Design goal:
part of a larger assembly, 5 chains, A mainly beta (135), B little secondary structure (51), C mainly beta (106), D little secondary structure (105), E little secondary structure (204), A: 135 residues, 3 helices, E: little secondary structure, two-stranded antiparallel ribbon, binds zinc ion, RNA-binding, ribosomal protein (chain D), cytoplasm (chain D), antibiotic resistance (chain D), Ribosomal_LSU_eL42 (chain D)
RNA sequence: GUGAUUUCUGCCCAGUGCUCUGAAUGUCAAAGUGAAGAAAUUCAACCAAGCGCGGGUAAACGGCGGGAGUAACUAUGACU
RNA sequence: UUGACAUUGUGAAGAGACAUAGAGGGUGUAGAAUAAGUGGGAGCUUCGGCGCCAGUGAAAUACCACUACCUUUAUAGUUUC
RNA sequence: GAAGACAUUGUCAGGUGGGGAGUUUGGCUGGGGCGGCACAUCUGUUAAACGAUAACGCAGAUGUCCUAAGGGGGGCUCAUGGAGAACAGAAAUCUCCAGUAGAACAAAAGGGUAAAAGCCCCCUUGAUUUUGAUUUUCAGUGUGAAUACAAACCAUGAAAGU
RNA sequence: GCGGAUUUAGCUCAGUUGGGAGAGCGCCAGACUGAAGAUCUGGAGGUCCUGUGUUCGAUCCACAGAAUUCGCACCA
RNA sequence: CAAUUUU
């Protein structure tokens, strides 16, 4: 479990946030096995990743990843979305496999408040629209 | 309150031991083969003051 | 604390008006109360079952319904700016007929 | 206060609707509670941090609690209630108090 | 069930060696506590009789003792004052009548040790006097139970065959159930053993 | 924690705090086992640490009061 | 600080515990005996001993039909330290 | 070399924890604090002869108790005083006469009561059930409390009734 | 609230088939010694917290109550 | 094993 930094365990707030030692870190444990690959393999692109082993305290993942600028990948049209620079670091902004379930996006009645990304569907309904010819 | 003065000690801030006149580590040799199967003959050179 | 009981500060109004002790005189049970009649109120401390309140003493009202020993009457009472037609409920001993509507009747 | 048994009174019923026998008893709360809506809407708020959401009670002032005796019919075997007012000591048995013979200081 | 044809078909026939009257008895297993809640109670219905050999200490002197003469054993009067103090110690069944509704003055001295006292544990002045003739000689437990359990009767006559011990056994099954709570264990009767006098041991 | 030297450091461990290699069910978590029922679930037993129990502890926190009777006239009480 | 679970793999011995079989004994009186049971009986037996219709004791007295309470014991089946 | 599936590491559960955090710590008050409750109630009075009314004014009380001390019916005279009868006296039980209440009615004060509402017997559970109206406090809100019914069921009495 | 624990002549141990209220200590008497002392014995006290069951009968096996603590929790 | 007083 993640615990927040908080020098010598002081919260400085109302007691609902006072507890320290058992926070949860809402992103997955796999998606933080992708950033620290991605921020040293900065020129590569990561397509997806998976699970391999679990000892006492490590949970190994084995990330597969793609060269965008390789000359066999800029041609050979099965994989010409990776060179298109909209997918520059498509793990750090969360759009990989766990970037599309821990971010929360699925169809349905029980994936509702995170159906098309939470922050868009927060600031679109507790805005208030005012027309010219107010209704 | 404050951190009382046996808590601000254990941080290495100013309470680091004064280490200018310590001549060296007062500790003896490790087990070579020549120590647990015979003898090797040492010779004292000088006696000093380790401050 | 303070006295705001149901029959507080009314020592002198429920005495049965000395040398007039004993039970009720039995002309009070051989007398009719039809609806529309006009009556007064005078409380007797003989029966502790159906007094009018401390306030409703010596005031005149019309009756509106009757039951086996009961007469409900209408009294106007004020609160600052208005009157309200109260609708009380009394045992029939505490009531005399108001002898004021003969000199208008006759 | 001394109360008897056998309490012959009006059953609620649909069978008799009439004065029948009622052998009285006296009840406590039974099982306290579990999984009953306002208990597990409450364990949702206790779980986690903060602690002691809904008000605990410290200022007690009473001494007697309102003995309530539940009836029990013997023909249709239903169960009605009634409440006596507050008393400190309450039995359910005998000593039909005879008049003032036995004083003996 | 305790017999479909299990262990009560063949072990009843080569014990025709003691010609003494053979009735195999019965107990069961029900634990209880130091209270006296629901033990040896619940007078059951056993239609097959005992053809018993005991005495009846009758208290009935109406001239329907014609009917008590053919339905009972010993016809006494109400001179019970001085004799019956420590006399009967082997007595199974007694039946008395409506004249003795208050004449229990001189039976409670003797009914303390054999313990068939005329309290609510042995109610002999029975109102209805027509059901209480034929069945009631049969042995069935009407006693104050000792500390944990007494649940007894004789199973059947070893001489009298098994014509009704597949259906009266089913109402031999219903004794201890419907008054106490389920503090009683389930399957009180289990492995059935038969020994009147001659039978060996067998566990079902 | 007291504050050179000299000379002393009296009595009290019931309260509070600390400690102990003492013994029992007296209470005592989740998990685990067993019984019922068709299950969710209920009930029971085992119930670790710690409390509790008993001891140790004042250069540990601290505390140091009363009341009777008794000595040749009183008085006071060495004494119980 | 303490316990549970993973971490975490392969063994022997000891000791209980648990049921499953079986086992022996067991207080104030008497009855016929160191009398802790039951509903009852009156006989199978080398005895005609013990019973009973006999005494008396809270009790009925040979037999458990089923165990009350033991471990004191024996083996494998459940595991546990 | 040690040590070894015990430790360590992680999750969950109990215990300890002013080290640390957040907060709170009433009100009325002849300043405030202390004292008290005048912070809900009730009785008599100050209250100024309808009603309403104050002060940390006055003298008191409440946070209960009751199988009867409730309900009904029948039946008796109370506290005291005079007069008498063995022990019997200042105080014992029995009797006569006077006896407007000077006694009693669970609990403070005030009202009330005489073939009773006091005391002695007999029988009982209306100390039920369904909802409404009404009076006092009131803003004419609620809670508390009480009055009079209707629809039922019953208890007592000879019934009227209660 | 809720589960245990104990109540004994004045006080403390007693007391467990259930047959037994006993010891000690407090008032009074006898002994002992030449006598005073100390020491010895005796006189008496008891509702075994109460009520009901349990049983031949109970402190003893229970349930309810009164009192005394131990703990353990805690949405009006 | 323990033993106090006798103007
Ligand atoms: Zn009914």
């Amino acid at each position: 479990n993640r615990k927040r930094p908080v020098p010598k365990g002081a919260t400085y707030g109302k007691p609902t946030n006072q507890g320290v030692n058992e926070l949860k870190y809402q992103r997955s444990l796999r998606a933080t096995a992708e950033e620290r690959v991605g921020r040293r393999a900065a020129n590569l692109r990561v397509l997806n990743s998976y699970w391999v082993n679990q000892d006492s305290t490590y949970k190994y993942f084995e990330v597969i990843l793609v060269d965008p600028q390789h000359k066999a990948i800029r041609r050979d049209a099965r994989y010409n979305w990776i060179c298109d620079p909209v997918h520059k670091h498509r793990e750090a902004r969360g759009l990989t496999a766990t970037g599309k379930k821990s971010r929360g996006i699925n169809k349905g009645h029980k994936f509702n408040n995170t159906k098309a990304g939470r922050r868009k569907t927060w600031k679109r309904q507790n805005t208030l629209s005012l027309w010219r010819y107010r209704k | 309150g404050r951190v009382i003065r046996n808590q601000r000690k254990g941080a290495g801030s100013i309470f680091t031991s004064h280490t200018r006149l310590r001549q060296g580590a007062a500790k003896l040799r490790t087990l070579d083969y020549a120590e647990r199967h015979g003898y090797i003959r040492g010779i004292v050179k000088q006696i000093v003051h380790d401050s | 604390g303070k006295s705001h009981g149901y029959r507080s500060r009314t020592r002198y109004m429920f005495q049965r008006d000395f040398r007039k002790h004993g039970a009720v005189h039995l002309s009070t049970y051989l007398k009719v109360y039809k609806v529309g009649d006009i009556v007064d109120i005078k409380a007797n401390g003989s029966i502790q079952k159906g007094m009018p309140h401390k306030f409703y003493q010596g005031k005149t009202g019309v009756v509106y319904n009757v039951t086996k020993s009961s007469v409900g009457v209408i009294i106007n009472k004020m609160v600052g700016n208005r009157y309200l037609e109260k609708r009380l409920n009394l045992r029939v001993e505490h009531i005399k007929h108001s002898k004021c509507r003969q000199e208008f009747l006759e | 206060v001394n109360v008897p048994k056998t309490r012959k009174t009006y059953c609620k019923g649909k069978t008799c609707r009439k004065h029948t026998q009622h052998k009285v008893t006296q009840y406590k709360a039974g099982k306290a509670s579990l999984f009953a809506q306002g208990k597990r809407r409450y364990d949702r708020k206790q779980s986690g941090f903060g602690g002691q959401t809904k008000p605990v009670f410290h200022k007690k002032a009473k001494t007697t609690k309102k003995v309530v005796l539940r009836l029990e019919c013997v023909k249709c075997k239903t169960r009605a209630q009634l409440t006596l007012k507050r008393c400190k000591h309450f039995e359910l048995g005998g000593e039909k108090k005879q008049k003032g013979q036995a004083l003996q200081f | 069930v305790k017999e479909l044809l299990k262990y009560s078909n063949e072990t009843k026939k080569r014990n025709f060696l003691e010609t003494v009257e053979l009735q195999v008895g019965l107990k069961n297993y029900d634990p209880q506590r130091d209270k006296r809640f629901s033990g040896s109670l619940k007078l059951p219905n056993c239609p097959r009789p005992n053809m018993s050999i005991c005495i009846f200490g009758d208290a009935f002197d109406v001239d329907r003792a014609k009917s008590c003469g053919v339905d009972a054993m010993s016809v006494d009067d109400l001179k019970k004052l001085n004799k019956n103090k420590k006399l009967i110690k082997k007595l199974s069944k007694k039946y008395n009548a409506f004249i003795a509704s208050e004449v229990l003055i001189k039976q409670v001295p003797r009914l303390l040790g054999p313990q068939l006292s005329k309290a609510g544990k042995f109610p002999t002045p029975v109102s209805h006097n027509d059901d209480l003739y034929g069945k009631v000689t049969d042995v069935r437990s009407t006693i104050k139970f000792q500390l944990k359990k007494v649940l007894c009767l004789a199973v059947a006559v070893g001489n009298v065959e098994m014509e009704e011990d597949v259906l009266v056994n089913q109402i031999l099954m219903s004794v201890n159930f419907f008054v106490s709570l389920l503090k009683k264990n389930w399957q009180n009767v289990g492995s059935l053993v038969v020994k009147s006098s001659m039978g060996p041991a067998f566990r079902l």
